[PDB]
Design a protein around this ligand. Structure first.
Ligand SMILES: CC(C)(COP(=O)(O)OP(=O)(O)OC[C@H]1O[C@@H](n2cnc3c(N)ncnc32)[C@H](O)[C@@H]1OP(=O)(O)O)[C@@H](O)C(=O)NCCC(=O)NCCS
Lengths: 140, 140
């Protein structure tokens, strides 16, 4: 009864990969700090961004469920990659700072909604205890 | 260590989000099972794909380190989402099957290169204990 999601990932050349998902094709490379090219998508930016997308889509469920009139949501993502005590690297922290536009009458529901969103977010769950995840917000 | 990676993610409408990294724009939405449109990227496909891209870029660092001559690399990724004992859902398993082309003389080095790639992959590290990760390969 699992829902199964499939994709393909190949080596182009050098430090360059191609992600294929349905009819979409994305170049995802090593970043400059590890010898890759400048100006491309990297796992280092794409993974935290997908985290922040999943957080937002989980929030949207709770937003509908709780009758919140959401006007806008913009989030800035800051991911820190650093040394692991197991050698090599790991994500130390991923910070997601959200600017939320809602009706004033809905503001009181937001702490709960945000906590729920992060709790039930599939990617948040995936990285629990291994990466510090700091989600905060301000009303605009 | 410490390197900072930044992105932005906004709500478009409905269950749709836009990822911005530099000048790159990517639509990432809930899947149809969770109220998103057909034919778009979803966190359920993108996140497993970025995991596989990270496995590959880590392997590429080790193959150069070890003098392995890599001819080709193709991988198929299957992600299975299901109910969580914590309520809601979680990724249960992500499988990555790699078809690797190498010089015959390099094949004896591949078990260790793959071990190292999986061990040091930072997205693999990020999901340790929370999602089952199954990586295997065949030569082509
Ligand atoms: C929403 C969802 C978590 C509900 O889970 P469930 O297994 O039915 O469990 P529950 O009904 O207990 O709800 C989970 C929590 O949400 C709370 N909740 C649900 N609806 C609520 C509402 N209308 N108002 C306030 N709280 C609500 C519950 O009280 C519960 O709280 P708790 O964690 O503190 O115990 C689940 O259906 C889901 O994950 N759906 C996918 C959401 C989605 O679209 N995500 C994006 C995918 S890309």
């Amino acid at each position: 009864g699992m829902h199964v999601y499939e994709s393909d990932v190949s080596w182009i050349d050098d430090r360059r990969t191609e992600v294929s998902v349905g009819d979409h094709r994305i170049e995802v490379d090593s970043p400059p700090e590890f010898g890759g090219p400048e100006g491309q998508l990297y796992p280092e930016t794409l993974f935290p961004s997908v985290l922040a997308s999943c957080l937002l889509t989980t929030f949207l469920e709770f937003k509908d469920r709780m009758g919140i009139n959401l006007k806008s949501w913009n989030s800035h993502v800051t991911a820190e990659l650093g040394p692991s005590p197991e050698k090599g690297f790991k994500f130390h922290r991923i910070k997601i700072h959200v600017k939320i536009g809602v009706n004033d009458e809905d503001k009181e529901k937001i702490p709960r909604a945000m906590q729920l969103a992060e709790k039930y977010c599939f990617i948040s769950r995936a990285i629990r205890n291994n990466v510090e995840e700091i989600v905060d917000y301000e009303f605009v």
